From TrEMBL, chain C:
Interacts with HSPA5; may regulate the function of HSPA5 in apoptosis and cell proliferation. This is Endosome/lysosome-associated apoptosis and autophagy regulator 1. The chain holds residues 242 to 318 of 1013 of the full protein. It is found in: Cell membrane; Endoplasmic reticulum membrane; Golgi apparatus, trans-Golgi network membrane; Late endosome membrane. It comes from Mus musculus. May protect cells from cell death by inducing cytosolic vacuolization and up-regulating the autophagy pathway. May play a role in apoptosis and cell proliferation through its interaction with HSPA5. Belongs to the ELAPOR family.
Length: 42, 89, 75
């Protein structure tokens, strides 16, 4: 699995918690394709 | 520069449900900027996983675990057995 | 620790060069780190990430170095 560039990923939001905070996570457009994805941020 | 967090610093969480109903079991650190090299996201359950009464959803493997001893789960529901005051709602 | 060099003024020199300072016994247990870019590790337990061979390239966390293109070179 080669490292993925800006193209094969979309940035999706996690589920809202009780306090109301979400995490911006980066998801491969199709399952199983790369590693070293950008770190999720608030 | 950052760490390679063990099982103790990264927690699984589901992404927002899309129109079709697919979720990704993305790995999230407990606090921002603490580790890198998180496990790759995998397919989650189709936005309708409902564990039966007495079970809780285990994120490591997406299945309903039978809980522990001396503890109850109430399942996908609620109960209003207490009536000292009017319950909220 | 002290590193010191004093050069005698003999009217002539090549400076002393120091690399890979490794001090053991500090801070008790430490955690694992992803391999730096351009370095790869094959099996678990590596105390260091081996350098990828020339004409090959790699990135962070890779277990192997991907081959490079024909029209490209890499030290
Ligand atoms: Cu935590
Ligand atoms: Cu390869």
């Amino acid at each position: 699995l080669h490292a993925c560039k800006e193209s094969e990923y979309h940035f999706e939001y996690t589920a809202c918690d009780s306090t109301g905070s979400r995490w911006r996570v980066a998801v491969p457009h199709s399952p199983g394709l790369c590693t070293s994805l950008p770190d999720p941020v608030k | 520069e950052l760490h390679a967090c063990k099982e103790s610093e990264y927690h699984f969480e589901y992404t927002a449900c899309d129109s079709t109903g697919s979720r990704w079991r993305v790995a999230v650190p407990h606090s921002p900027g603490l580790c890198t090299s998180l496990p790759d996201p995998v397919k989650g359950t189709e936005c309708s996983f409902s564990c039966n009464a007495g079970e809780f959803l285990d994120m490591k493997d997406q299945s309903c675990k039978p809980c522990a001893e001396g503890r109850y789960s109430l399942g996908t529901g609620i109960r209003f057995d207490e009536w000292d005051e009017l319950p909220h709602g | 620790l002290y590193w010191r060099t004093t050069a005698f003024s003999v009217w002539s020199s090549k400076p002393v060069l120091v690399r890979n300072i490794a001090i053991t016994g500090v801070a008790y247990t430490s955690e694992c780190f992803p391999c730096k870019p351009g370095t790869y590790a094959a099996k678990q337990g590596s105390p260091f990430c081996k350098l990828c061979p020339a004409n090959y390239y790699s990135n962070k966390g890779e277990t192997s170095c991907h081959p490079c293109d024909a029209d490209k070179y890499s030290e």
